[PDB]
Design a binder for this molecule. Structure first.
Ligand SMILES: [Mn+2]
Ligand SMILES: [Mn+2]
Ligand SMILES: [Mn+2]
Length: 430
DNA sequence: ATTATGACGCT
DNA sequence: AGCGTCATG
């Protein structure tokens, strides 16, 4: 009735860089621009594993996780850029620095939450109130929203993509009641104006294009961002949620793409996010736990309260390498050499971090995988991180993993190691 | 033999 | 603390 809280109090955007590592490489090498191209890690095994794909190449079926040799079967003219290798491993510094460029631009408009190397949520509620006070009642011109889709429109009583985008936007803007600064649809619209400006600033100042979603919470903003890529933004209003969710597979919503979403589907006998509305909050909590159940109950109605956290920097700084199949580490000298390689990269990144961000890590986490273990991590052990020195860090990691060697020979390592991972955590202002 | 990250929930 | 899940450039 009048006391139902519809979760329309915030304006939240999710900005995601289009095929990010590809764009970084295309900015650096103009010969790659506007071409089918992909970014690969390594090269010897099947041409390298693809981790990013330009939209031109996606049209040929090239995807992330493809081996480049297989991708070349789909797209023989595919161009490839390789991630830098340093100390025997992939080194992603170039992409982390490019990410910082984008994040610093976004931070000029509002508080952001770094959600990945190429995406950030934006809490625009306050910026929207500001812009609405500046608009002094003036209507919102379509010219202010030149790359915005309104999800669900056009509807009701041109066969070109841009024509439909414009028709839907016109329908939306024509319905807009711009006379109260408290309408959630108006607030979302102003949010989209701001996101147009933010995306223009990112492209002007970095060369990088991005997509974005604008809605009332993080989950809807992320979902919205995916609806119209690349180089476009999408507004998902509260009112669009019933129709949008009525045919939305459950796995498309962030956090439901894995085992939990599979159990929602199997236990409840449903397929689409909207079907969740027919269950009581207690029913959902009974199957999926109190937190998940309350979250699902609100989220299938378009409502979620998870805040945009004020955090532009990563909480951990880590280094990892797999040693698959026959290249697993089987001698103590091997394990120690690779721990040193990882620790040297970690030292370099940590020292840069301390200089840039006025903080120091205080905990070192060591994770390994042993051959024949199905898990991603066989074992995790922590120890104190008291100095940014790679030799000490690698000695300490060896000390906390040494008792895993079930070999009679101390020169051999059994069972061989298929993964090493060093992660610095628990940062403190320095 | 996708690999290299990173956040967060659970107990 | 150590383990598992989700995301996935
Ligand atoms: Mn992206
Ligand atoms: Mn992303
Ligand atoms: Mn992606």
């Amino acid at each position: 009735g009048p006391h139902m809280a519809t979760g329309q109090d915030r304006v939240v955007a999710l900005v995601d860089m289009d095929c990010f590592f590809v764009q970084v490489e295309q900015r650096q090498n103009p010969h790659l621009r506007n071409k089918p191209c992909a970014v690969v890690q390594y090269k010897s095994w099947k041409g390298g594993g693809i981790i990013a794909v330009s939209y031109e190449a996606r049209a040929f079926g090239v995807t992330r996780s493809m081996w480049a040799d297989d991708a070349k079967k789909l797209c023989p003219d595919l161009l490839l850029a390789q991630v830098r290798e340093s100390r025997g491993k992939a080194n992603l510094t170039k992409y982390r620095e490019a990410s910082v460029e984008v994040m610093e631009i976004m931070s000029r408009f509002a508080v952001i939450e770094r959600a990945s190397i190429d995406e950030a949520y934006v809490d625009l509620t306050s910026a929207v109130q500001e812009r609405l006070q500046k608009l002094q009642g003036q209507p919102i011109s379509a010219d202010l929203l030149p790359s915005t889709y309104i999800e669900g429109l056009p509807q009701g009583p041109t066969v070109q993509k841009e024509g439909m985008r414009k028709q839907g936007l016109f329908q939306w803007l024509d319905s807009l009641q711009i006379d109260n600064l408290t309408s959630p649809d108006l607030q979302l619209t102003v949010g989209a104006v701001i996101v147009e400006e933010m995306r223009a600033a990112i492209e002007r100042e970095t060369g990088f294009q991005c997509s974005a979603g604008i809605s009332h919470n993080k989950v809807l903003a992320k979902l919205a961002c995916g609806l119209n890529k690349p180089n476009r933004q999408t507004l998902v209003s509260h009112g669009s949620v019933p129709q949008l969710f009525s045919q939305m597979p459950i796995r498309k919503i962030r956090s439901l793409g894995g085992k939990l979403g599979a159990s929602v589907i199997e236990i409840l006998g449903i397929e689409y996010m909207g079907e969740l509305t027919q269950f009581t909050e207690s029913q959902l909590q009974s199957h999926f736990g109190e937190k998940n159940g309350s979250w699902l109950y609100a989220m299938c109605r378009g409502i979620e309260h998870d805040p945009v956290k004020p955090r532009q920097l990563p909480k951990t700084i880590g280094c990892s390498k797999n040693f698959p199949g026959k290249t697993a580490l089987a001698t103590r000298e091997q394990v120690q050499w690779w721990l040193l390689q990882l620790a040297q990269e970690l030292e370099e990144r940590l020292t840069k971090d301390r200089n840039d961000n006025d903080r120091v890590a205080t905990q070192l986490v060591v994770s390994i995988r042993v051959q024949g273990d199905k898990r991603l991590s066989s074992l995790r052990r922590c120890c104190a991180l008291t100095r940014y020195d790679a030799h000490k860090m690698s000695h300490d990691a060896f000390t906390v993993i040494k008792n895993c060697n079930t070999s009679g020979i101390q020169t051999e390592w059994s069972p061989p190691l298929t993964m090493l991972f060093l992660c610095a955590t628990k940062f403190s202002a320095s």
